Design an enzyme around this catalytic site. Structure first.
Site, PDB file in Angstrom:
ATOM      1  N   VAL B  39      24.586  36.749  18.289  1.00  0.00           N
ATOM      2  CA  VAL B  39      24.203  35.335  18.184  1.00  0.00           C
ATOM      3  C   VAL B  39      25.307  34.488  18.829  1.00  0.00           C
ATOM      4  CG1 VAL B  39      23.436  33.415  16.731  1.00  0.00           C
ATOM      5  CG2 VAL B  39      22.890  35.786  16.059  1.00  0.00           C
ATOM      6  N   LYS B  75      39.948  12.193  28.130  1.00  0.00           N
ATOM      7  CA  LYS B  75      38.976  11.199  27.730  1.00  0.00           C
ATOM      8  C   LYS B  75      39.666   9.923  27.253  1.00  0.00           C
ATOM      9  CE  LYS B  75      35.359  10.148  24.513  1.00  0.00           C
ATOM     10  NZ  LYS B  75      34.617  10.577  23.329  1.00  0.00           N
ATOM     11  N   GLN B 148      48.644   3.630  19.737  1.00  0.00           N
ATOM     12  CA  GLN B 148      48.214   2.397  20.400  1.00  0.00           C
ATOM     13  C   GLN B 148      47.168   2.638  21.502  1.00  0.00           C
ATOM     14  OE1 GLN B 148      48.971  -0.242  18.763  1.00  0.00           O
ATOM     15  NE2 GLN B 148      48.176  -1.819  20.148  1.00  0.00           N
ATOM     16  N   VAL B 180      26.087  39.459   9.579  1.00  0.00           N
ATOM     17  CA  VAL B 180      25.834  39.346   8.156  1.00  0.00           C
ATOM     18  C   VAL B 180      24.331  39.448   7.930  1.00  0.00           C
ATOM     19  CG1 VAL B 180      25.947  37.809   6.134  1.00  0.00           C
ATOM     20  CG2 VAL B 180      27.952  38.159   7.625  1.00  0.00           C
ATOM     21  N   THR B 341      31.358  13.350  18.048  1.00  0.00           N
ATOM     22  CA  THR B 341      31.840  13.477  16.658  1.00  0.00           C
ATOM     23  C   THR B 341      31.847  14.865  16.045  1.00  0.00           C
ATOM     24  OG1 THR B 341      29.708  12.503  15.947  1.00  0.00           O
ATOM     25  CG2 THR B 341      31.671  11.104  15.851  1.00  0.00           C
ATOM     26  N   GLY B 342      31.192  15.831  16.675  1.00  0.00           N
ATOM     27  CA  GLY B 342      31.119  17.203  16.157  1.00  0.00           C
ATOM     28  C   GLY B 342      32.449  17.826  15.750  1.00  0.00           C
TER      29      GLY B 342
HETATM   30  C1  LIG Z   1      23.911  19.640  22.708  1.00  0.00           C
HETATM   31  C2  LIG Z   1      25.154  19.516  21.863  1.00  0.00           C
HETATM   32  C3  LIG Z   1      26.215  18.793  22.376  1.00  0.00           C
HETATM   33  C4  LIG Z   1      27.389  18.668  21.670  1.00  0.00           C
HETATM   34  N1  LIG Z   1      28.415  17.936  22.202  1.00  0.00           N
HETATM   35  C5  LIG Z   1      29.603  17.756  21.505  1.00  0.00           C
HETATM   36  C6  LIG Z   1      30.674  17.010  22.038  1.00  0.00           C
HETATM   37  O1  LIG Z   1      30.630  16.457  23.150  1.00  0.00           O
HETATM   38  N2  LIG Z   1      31.826  16.884  21.280  1.00  0.00           N
HETATM   39  C7  LIG Z   1      31.931  17.463  20.027  1.00  0.00           C
HETATM   40  O2  LIG Z   1      32.945  17.354  19.333  1.00  0.00           O
HETATM   41  N3  LIG Z   1      30.890  18.202  19.554  1.00  0.00           N
HETATM   42  C8  LIG Z   1      29.730  18.347  20.251  1.00  0.00           C
HETATM   43  N4  LIG Z   1      28.700  19.086  19.704  1.00  0.00           N
HETATM   44  C9  LIG Z   1      28.913  19.834  18.422  1.00  0.00           C
HETATM   45  C10 LIG Z   1      29.628  21.159  18.660  1.00  0.00           C
HETATM   46  O3  LIG Z   1      28.731  22.017  19.294  1.00  0.00           O
HETATM   47  C11 LIG Z   1      30.081  21.781  17.348  1.00  0.00           C
HETATM   48  O4  LIG Z   1      30.627  20.781  16.522  1.00  0.00           O
HETATM   49  C12 LIG Z   1      31.103  22.914  17.506  1.00  0.00           C
HETATM   50  O5  LIG Z   1      30.978  23.658  18.697  1.00  0.00           O
HETATM   51  C13 LIG Z   1      30.982  23.890  16.353  1.00  0.00           C
HETATM   52  O6  LIG Z   1      29.715  24.474  16.211  1.00  0.00           O
HETATM   53  P1  LIG Z   1      29.622  25.612  15.084  1.00  0.00           P
HETATM   54  O7  LIG Z   1      30.889  26.451  15.131  1.00  0.00           O
HETATM   55  O8  LIG Z   1      29.430  24.913  13.764  1.00  0.00           O
HETATM   56  O9  LIG Z   1      28.282  26.480  15.318  1.00  0.00           O
HETATM   57  P2  LIG Z   1      27.952  27.592  16.450  1.00  0.00           P
HETATM   58  O10 LIG Z   1      28.648  27.307  17.739  1.00  0.00           O
HETATM   59  O11 LIG Z   1      26.454  27.673  16.545  1.00  0.00           O
HETATM   60  O12 LIG Z   1      28.496  28.969  15.824  1.00  0.00           O
HETATM   61  C14 LIG Z   1      27.762  29.706  14.874  1.00  0.00           C
HETATM   62  C15 LIG Z   1      28.485  31.021  14.666  1.00  0.00           C
HETATM   63  O13 LIG Z   1      27.938  31.671  13.544  1.00  0.00           O
HETATM   64  C16 LIG Z   1      27.703  33.013  13.853  1.00  0.00           C
HETATM   65  N5  LIG Z   1      26.631  33.560  13.033  1.00  0.00           N
HETATM   66  C17 LIG Z   1      25.409  33.010  12.786  1.00  0.00           C
HETATM   67  N6  LIG Z   1      24.754  33.860  11.986  1.00  0.00           N
HETATM   68  C18 LIG Z   1      25.528  34.928  11.711  1.00  0.00           C
HETATM   69  C19 LIG Z   1      25.352  36.075  10.949  1.00  0.00           C
HETATM   70  N7  LIG Z   1      24.210  36.349  10.333  1.00  0.00           N
HETATM   71  N8  LIG Z   1      26.378  36.996  10.885  1.00  0.00           N
HETATM   72  C20 LIG Z   1      27.572  36.794  11.550  1.00  0.00           C
HETATM   73  N9  LIG Z   1      27.722  35.660  12.294  1.00  0.00           N
HETATM   74  C21 LIG Z   1      26.722  34.747  12.375  1.00  0.00           C
HETATM   75  C22 LIG Z   1      27.357  33.000  15.322  1.00  0.00           C
HETATM   76  O14 LIG Z   1      27.532  34.271  15.878  1.00  0.00           O
HETATM   77  C23 LIG Z   1      28.332  31.968  15.842  1.00  0.00           C
HETATM   78  O15 LIG Z   1      29.588  32.534  16.074  1.00  0.00           O
HETATM   79  C24 LIG Z   1      27.522  19.258  20.416  1.00  0.00           C
HETATM   80  C25 LIG Z   1      26.456  19.993  19.897  1.00  0.00           C
HETATM   81  C26 LIG Z   1      25.267  20.131  20.609  1.00  0.00           C
HETATM   82  C27 LIG Z   1      24.135  20.938  20.008  1.00  0.00           C
HETATM   83 CL   LIG Z   2      29.270  15.384  18.999  1.00  0.00          CL
END
Ligand SMILES: Cc1cc2nc3c(=O)[nH]c(=O)nc-3n(C[C@H](O)[C@H](O)[C@H](O)COP(=O)(O)OP(=O)(O)OC[C@H]3O[C@@H](n4cnc5c(N)ncnc54)[C@H](O)[C@@H]3O)c2cc1C
Ligand SMILES: [Cl-]
Ligand SMILES: Cc1cc2nc3c(=O)[nH]c(=O)nc-3n(C[C@H](O)[C@H](O)[C@H](O)COP(=O)(O)OP(=O)(O)OC[C@H]3O[C@@H](n4cnc5c(N)ncnc54)[C@H](O)[C@@H]3O)c2cc1C
Ligand SMILES: [Cl-]
Lengths: 496, 496
Positions: B39, B75, B148, B180, B341-342
């Protein structure tokens, strides 16, 4: 553009307003102040809050200039005495907590700590040693750096008003000594003028009501509704004595708030005397009983000394700005002086009046923003004050037993739950501006005895060494400061 | 004391958490991270918010070290394009407004002002000239002084995860690559462990859910309630392209947010390439239509470039901390990346997790305080984002017409009313911490066209000379900075 301001009332409220308006707008505003020759302004010794330096700076006045002319003293904080354990006291200082590795010293104190205030604040030692906050050469002890230790003042209310009237008159404020007998209104209920006994009608664009508890314009003319806080803060009277201090060296650079049998008592150290006042609820003690208890405590046998009795209107107007009238001071609001907020309320109301100053199109949205700010300012303080009574552990008289079970403002229950688990912070104190910062909320809780059950668990996972070092620095820097600084009286004598 | 943390998920959320925990607690915490080998984590180019420097400082990492390893860019702010009319734009920069005589430059601009950002911010000029925020010798343009002008970064999401996994593994994080399959719960509903395909059960005291939109632990196991924001913010999908840069010197030191026909598009400048993404609502445009519009705008004819399609879960969990499980990242909450904001939500969740780290007793009052903070953080941003759609003056497609009349969060109506009369401030913006400060609310309003009807009346009563001198200083300092600073690319090339 609005042309003219008419201030009614010549207390601290009126003269602070007059002075500030002139400092802000100079000759681009006309200001007239009307005050009675026979209704007396509130004249006791008073304490102030940390923002007050800004007011004098704004007026262009150095403390060496104004403070001696108002029988002034220094306020490093408030000493709270006998609120919980009998004979136990603590300080609520004007001093921010230091931060080590993301946690303030209060958090560290709970984990690795001597009382809280003694361990965490320089000001504690300064108070115990009765130091001035300035070296004899005039330099601040911190070596702005004034924000890190934002001390305030004690002074004579009459003198400061007298001094400010002089400042304001020197800058073009028209002064009328007369009684306002009738307040005129136009066809929309707006104030058109104030009618005096001997000077006819006085008119202007904006009326500032500085008439005290009376609220002659805002309440008696405009029908503004006053919201009482008696249900959560029942203190409604005060009796004060002015006591000469036989010893100079006894002058303390702080206000004292001593819990009494049915209220509490202030000690405000002025230059040659101490003011003492017993703030109480007449539901639990008579004015006569209160005078006797005060006298016994601070001046036994001294019947040469006259007692000053005052009734207090506790609470706030729903709106301090109605139509073309703004209330500033006791006309607007008032809470008991447990945290020295009266002049703070005046200064903030005025600063914000300048910010919300009306144009020729009176903007109701702007006015409503002003009114929200004034509501929050007092409501935040009200809540903080109730916390003092809830924190007090003593339960020895019917008054203290009743304080324990008395109803609370909305939001305080939650803050007390939080406090039993961990310290309040910026996100969990009262969220709108009310003068006080996080350290004030924390310090009152810790001093009164509202203490987290256990330290913050994160701290057990961290190296305590940097915090322990910081505590040692604080004790060390304290030792050095009390050796280098003159006494409170010493410094004041040198600038008279 | 609790000993062991199990993080499920190896995206940015997982590795930020792993790293931060190690940096905070070193060997006083055991951390295991489990991530799927099949994934995929979200891998686009991403923009950040001003607090992100603190995260890297905390880790002990200089920007010269980490930024080149993540295809990093600068940025300085966000350029908003076409939110009203084709060919019109403004900046939302990371820069605090200067204050003259008690009023900020925005208030002065309305009274005595050239667009608002151009008049009020140095950053405006830096963006227009594509400058780096650093001189070639590495010094900050401000000459902390970093507060600043609190610039942030662009980077590759995969790279930063890769880089942080290395940081964390170098510091003793156990790494397990596996799926998992089942999450175990004890009699009370607490998580007991996670069952993997090839590594058996992995257990610990605290479980961090970093599984993304899926919320494997917080939603699928614990039954956490997810609160959708679709009613006020309908965008629910994205399509992204990665577009190589012909000319290095085309590299911009800011994110661009360009309003499109049924949503908006980001441009995020990385070191070798630009990321572009169309964020949209599938109520108004199909995923196919959206890809075509995106392709037409940024890469016509470039069918060699692969489009990445993503469904977004928009909103937040009611509680991100349930039992012994805390959600961090997309499992916790998400709003469209309109204000980057992510990663901000991740960092703040983590910083506050350390602050609210549990001991053996698992204090429910402490946990509850954590949940309130996380709710406010996202709700504040949600309200700020709706403001963007309400301020947008364009009404040229069904999407924009529908944005005009769509329901708002509670509290926004009042902010819009205030804004038609005067500028929002610290007391009238969203009151709990949500990253953004007053200048951000104001800047969006003025940029988008939500402007006070008239200047602040107080200003007409004041001397305009000092403000006029400040505006001149800003224009002058601007001129000097763009002459002295290297380009965005130049500086980045010099540290690769
Ligand atoms: C289109 C888009 C644009 C974005 N742009 C920005 C931006 O410009 N700036 C910013 O700060 N944020 C942005 N974000 C948000 C950013 O993507 C996230 O805040 C950040 O990358 C963290 O995502 P994550 O780690 O929570 O989830 P994910 O990247 O989806 O990671 C999920 C993890 O969980 C694991 N996992 C899932 N299920 C299982 C399982 N059953 N067993 C073991 N592992 C599992 C996967 O393998 C993966 O490693 C954006 C998001 C999107 C969708
Ligand atoms: Cl974001
Ligand atoms: C017991 C007590 C203790 C306090 N302690 C502190 C403290 O420690 N620190 C602090 O900051 N604050 C303290 N305060 C608050 C403080 O007294 C006030 O904030 C401050 O002095 C301003 O009062 P005022 O000007 O609003 O009202 P007042 O002092 O009552 O002035 C009213 C004015 O209006 C005039 N007036 C009334 N009617 C008419 C009329 N018909 N025509 C013309 N003029 C009229 C009067 O002549 C007078 O000049 C305390 C208050 C009390 C009661
Ligand atoms: Cl007071």
């Amino acid at each position: 553009m609005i042309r003219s301001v008419v201030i009614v009332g010549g207390g601290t409220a009126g003269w602070m307003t007059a002075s500030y308006l002139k400092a802000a707008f100079d000759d681009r505003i006309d200001v007239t102040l009307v005050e009675s020759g026979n209704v007396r302004r509130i004249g006791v010794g008073q304490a102030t809050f940390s923002t007050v330096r800004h007011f004098f700076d704004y007026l262009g006045l150095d403390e060496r200039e104004w403070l001696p002319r108002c029988a002034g003293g220094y306020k490093l904080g408030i000493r709270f005495e006998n609120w919980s354990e009998p004979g136990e006291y603590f300080y609520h200082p004007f001093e921010r907590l230091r931060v080590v590795d993301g946690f303030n010293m209060a958090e560290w104190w709970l984990a690795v700590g001597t009382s809280f205030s003694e361990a965490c604040y320089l000001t504690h030692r300064l108070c115990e040693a009765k130091r001035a906050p300035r070296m004899l050469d005039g330099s601040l002890f911190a070596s702005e750096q004034r924000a890190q230790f934002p001390y305030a003042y004690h002074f004579d209310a009459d003198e400061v008003a007298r001094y400010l009237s002089e400042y304001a008159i020197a800058r073009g404020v028209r002064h009328v000594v007369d009684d306002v007998q009738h307040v005129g209104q136009d066809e929309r209920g707006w104030i058109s003028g104030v009618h005096t006994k001997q000077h006819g009608e006085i008119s202007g664009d904006l009326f500032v009501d500085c008439t005290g508890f009376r609220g002659l314009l805002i309440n008696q003319t405009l029908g503004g509704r006053f919201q009482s806080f008696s249900d959560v803060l029942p203190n409604n009277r005060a009796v004060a004595l002015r006591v000469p201090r036989e010893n100079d060296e006894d002058m303390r650079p702080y206000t004292t708030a001593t819990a009494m049998s049915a209220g509490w008592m202030w000690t405000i150290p002025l230059f040659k005397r101490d003011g003492n006042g017993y703030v109480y609820s007449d539901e639990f003690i008579s004015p006569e009983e209160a005078e006797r208890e005060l006298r016994s405590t601070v001046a036994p046998g001294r019947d040469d000394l006259e007692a000053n009795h005052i009734q207090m209107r506790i609470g706030r107007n729903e709106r301090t700005w109605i139509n073309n009238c703004v209330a500033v001071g006791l006309s607007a609001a008032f809470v008991e002086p447990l945290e020295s907020t009266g002049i703070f309320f005046i200064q903030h109301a005025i600063e914000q009046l300048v910010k919300h100053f009306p144009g020729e199109r009176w903007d109701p949205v702007l006015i409503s923003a002003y009114n929200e700010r004034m509501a929050h300012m007092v409501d935040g303080v009200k809540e903080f004050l109730v916390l003092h009574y809830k924190g007090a552990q003593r339960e020895d008289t019917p008054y203290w037993k009743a304080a324990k079970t008395r109803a609370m403002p909305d939001g305080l229950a939650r803050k007390l739950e939080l406090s039993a688990s961990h310290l309040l912070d910026e996100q969990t104190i009262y969220p709108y501006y009310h003068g006080f910062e996080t350290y004030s909320w924390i310090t009152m809780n810790l001093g009164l005895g509202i203490v987290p059950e256990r330290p913050r668990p994160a701290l057990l996972h961290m190296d305590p060494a940097p915090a322990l070092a910081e505590f040692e620095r604080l004790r060390r820097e304290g030792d050095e400061l009390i050796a280098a600084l003159p006494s409170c009286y010493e410094y004041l004598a040198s600038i008279q």
